[PDB]
Every structure is written in structure tokens, then in C-alpha cells.
């Protein structure tokens, strides 16, 4: 469970994400695909993007980066009372996209990496620790929904 102080560390950095949602979302998806290329294979919509330059040049990918961060932000804003927000996501990721928890670990690592790269004087150990706790909670709760839905994850 996160404390109020930890949620305030998480939402203070989220405000920074909000100053450029498309840029952070684009950077996160490209870092995910660069670091874990097998995750691209889960996206029939984007597997044509066979180089990093092609990914950067894709407005459709950038649009999806915004969709992704918007959903994550809506979850984080609920501080752990996020059950309604999480439900459709766990549903689609379990039953349609079939995204294992390990790949949610990979994207959580990409989020942290990008927050560090974009925010050098502004994303320190306490903030990163708290963001890692919020993303762990996110993954924990998704995994509980995966199990109710019968999906190994
Ligand atoms: C922070 C984690 C994530 C969030 C918040 C997120 C959010 C979303 C949202 C809001 C959508 C559109 C609505 C839906 O279908 O549910 C979506 C679609 C999708 N997601 Fe995720 N996602 C996450 C992680 C991942 C990961 C790690 C993968 C794959 C390795 C993935 C694969 C997909 C696929 C395949 C689609 C459908 C894209 C399309 O063809 O339009 N998601 N995601």
C-alpha cells in the first residue's frame, strides 16, 4: 500500500508527464520496443515499424502513446482506489491482446527509464521508488484480474 506522501511523489511527476503527454508516450513505446523487441510482436497494428526511425516517424504510434498514458494517468490519479479504471484494461489485455505480466514489467521499466532521461534534475530516488511502488501495485492488481479472467499472464 502507498502512503499519501508516496502518492503525492507519483502525482508530482505525473504533472510533468502532462506537460508533454505525446512525447513521453512516444519515448516510452520506442524504449519498450528497443529494449524488448518481442513486445512489438504483440502489436499487429505496429509491427510494420521495423526500425526505431520508423517508430519515431509514426503519428499512429504517437497517438497510441497518448492513449496508453492517458489510461495510466487516470489509474494513478485514483491512488489505489482504481478498480473501475483498471477493469476494462485488464479485460482487454487479458482476453484480446494477451499481454503477460512480464511485458507489463518491461513497460514499467521503460516508463522509469524515460522519466529519468526526460527529467534529469527532477526524478530522484524517492520519486523513482514511489513510481516503482505505484507501477508494482498496478501490475499486482492487473494480475489479480487476469487470474479471475482465467488468463495465465
Ligand atoms: C502501462 C501499461 C499499459 C497501459 C496503461 C495500456 C493501455 C492501453 C489502452 C488504453 C489501449 C486501448 C484500449 C484497450 O484495448 O484496452 C491499449 C491497447 C493495446 N495494448 Fe496496451 N497498455 C499497457 C501495456 C501494454 C503492453 C506492455 C502491451 C504489449 C506488449 C500492450 C498491448 C496492447 C495492444 C496490442 C493493444 C491494441 C492496439 C491496437 O491494435 O489498437 N499494452 N493499451
Ligand 1, pocket residues at CB < 6 Å: 39, 42-43, 45, 67-68, 71-72, 89, 92-93, 97, 99, 103-104, 107
* Distance in angstroms (rounded) separating the CA atoms of residues 25 and 30: 9
* Distance in angstroms (rounded) separating the CA atoms of residues 24 and 29: 9
- CATH topology (fold) of 1-153: Globin-like (1.10.490)
Resolution (A): 1.4
- Secondary structure (3-state) at 13: helix
* Distance in angstroms (rounded) separating the CA atoms of residues 72 and 85: 9
* Distance in angstroms (rounded) separating the CA atoms of residues 20 and 33: 20
Task: Report yes or no: 108 and 99 within 8 Å, Cβ to Cβ.
Answer: no
Experimental method: X-ray
Amino acid at each position: 500500500v502507498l502512503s499519501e506522501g508516496e502518492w503525492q511523489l507519483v502525482l508530482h511527476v505525473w504533472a510533468k508527464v502532462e506537460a508533454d503527454v505525446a512525447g513521453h508516450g512516444q519515448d516510452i513505446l520506442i524504449r519498450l520496443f528497443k529494449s524488448h523487441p518481442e513486445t512489438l510482436e504483440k502489436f499487429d497494428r505496429f509491427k510494420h515499424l521495423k526500425t526505431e526511425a520508423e517508430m519515431k516517424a509514426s503519428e499512429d504510434l504517437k497517438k497510441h502513446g497518448v492513449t496508453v498514458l492517458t489510461a495510466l494517468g487516470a489509474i494513478l490519479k485514483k491512488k489505489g482506489h482504481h478498480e473501475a479504471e483498471l477493469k476494462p484494461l485488464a479485460q482487454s489485455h487479458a482476453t484480446k491482446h494477451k499481454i503477460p505480466i512480464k511485458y507489463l514489467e518491461f513497460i514499467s521499466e521503460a516508463i522509469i527509464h524515460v522519466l529519468h532521461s526526460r527529467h534529469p534534475g527532477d526524478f530522484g530516488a524517492d520519486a523513482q521508488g514511489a513510481m516503482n511502488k505505484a507501477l508494482e501495485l498496478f501490475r499486482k492488481d492487473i494480475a489479480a484480474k487476469y487470474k479471475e479472467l482465467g488468463y495465465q499472464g
